Amino acid sequence: QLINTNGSWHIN
Amino acid sequence: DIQMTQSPSSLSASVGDRVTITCRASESVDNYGISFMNWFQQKPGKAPKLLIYSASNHASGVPSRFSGSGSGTDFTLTISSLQPEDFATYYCHQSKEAPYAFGQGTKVEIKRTVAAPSVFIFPPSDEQLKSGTASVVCLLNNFYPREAKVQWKVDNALQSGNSQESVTEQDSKDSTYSLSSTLTLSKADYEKHKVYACEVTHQGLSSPVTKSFNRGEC
Amino acid sequence: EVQLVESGGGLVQPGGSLRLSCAASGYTFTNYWINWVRQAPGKGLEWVGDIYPSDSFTNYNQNFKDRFTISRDKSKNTAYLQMNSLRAEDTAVYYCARSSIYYGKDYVLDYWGQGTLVTVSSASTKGPSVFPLAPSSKSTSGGTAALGCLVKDYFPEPVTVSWNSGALTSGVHTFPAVLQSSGLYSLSSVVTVPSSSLGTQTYICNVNHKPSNTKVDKKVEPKSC
Prior knowledge:
The structure holds three protein chains of three kinds.
Chain A: E1 2-3, E2 10-11
Antiparallel strand pairs in A: 1-2
Chain B: E1 4-7, E2 10-14, E3 19-25, E4 30-31, E5 34-35, E6 37-42, E7 49-53, E8 57-58, E9 66-71, E10 74-79, E11 88-94, E12 101-102, E13 106-111, E14 118-122, H1 126-130, E15 133-143, E16 148-154, E17 157-158, E18 163-167, E19 177-186, H2 187-190, E20 195-202, E21 209-214
Chain C: E1 3-7, E2 10-12, E3 18-25, E4 32-39, E5 46-52, E6 57-60, E7 68-73, E8 78-83, E9 92-100, E10 111-112, E11 116-120, E12 129-133, E13 144-154, E14 160-163, E15 172-174, E16 178-179, E17 185-194, E18 203-209, E19 214-220
Parallel strand pairs in C: 2-11
Antiparallel strand pairs in C: 1-3, 3-8, 4-5, 4-9, 5-6, 7-8, 9-10, 9-11, 12-13, 13-17, 14-18, 15-17, 16-17, 18-19
């Protein structure tokens, strides 16, 4: 449920 | 930049041994309760294979003997029972923040009992002699350890700067190595000498083994 | 099912440009980052960079910025690595690997391509010369015999060596190629067989050097001296 779309991990 | 250093850079261990490889990151790889440190195994001539991810998770199709541990800056990979197939370079890798990086790697070699080489000499091919070159090949087959001295002698004169060695990777079954040395001379240089010998020195041999022939397509 | 196939490698002149391609298949292409990793012969792995296929978001290794360009073609399921003004230093095996946009099972560098060798050299494509390494140099018969093929004077790497069209693999040792003072590569492929099979078996080494379009099927038969 964590995503990396910018070269880092974020909650989404 | 998050960078890592692995320890040791190299190791030699026996089948059945517990092997421990460490990885230190310059900064923490922790985020959202996950430790973004992964382990890859790279076999010779093959792309690296995912073993362990997020410090302790097991990739599918990876044996039980491989396990991982750690948090923040310090990580460990353990092979519980070293198998002969486990010969590889092992890399830690960070997936927390770009730039992603790998450690320098740790070469794991498998320690076996001493094995002497089997020596074979090959005269130059008749068709090579038509192209004006002469390559004499020496083969040292299935030996342990890797350290082996191969000296070329031409009419008993110790050769220098005209030979090339190549060592095979450790066998995944019997853990032995193999080597080929190639004495290369001109057809003219080859045509002035009779005896072409390959003298082999290895721990497994009581004294040097000598494989030779006398020039000619006899 | 899932496969990444690198392409567009091979020999390139120094100062020249190369466009490497990573053909992806068997998954939703926009759901996995494509990473480019290089490996200099006999050295460690180096992260070059990555591309997010949905918006073309790209991350680079500071050393590769402005010379290396990672792009994509969503329609062709291919990520690209443009490498310009190449130096001898750049000579390496270039891999591509996918990494999930979502954290989950085997998310990180799950699948890799086979890699492509990029050789940055002014030298030309030279095809090999395959010479047989016949069994029994001077003394005939025994228990176990060795024979082989000498793959000589080719450029660049690689070369593939097979025995009896893949049928013979046991006891085969295809030595890593070594670079001669001449700048040309050379290797030998060897095989240990029981001496009692020499009178019956026909041994052929299948040599392929794709760079020079060279395919050689040479026979290895015994000789007296």
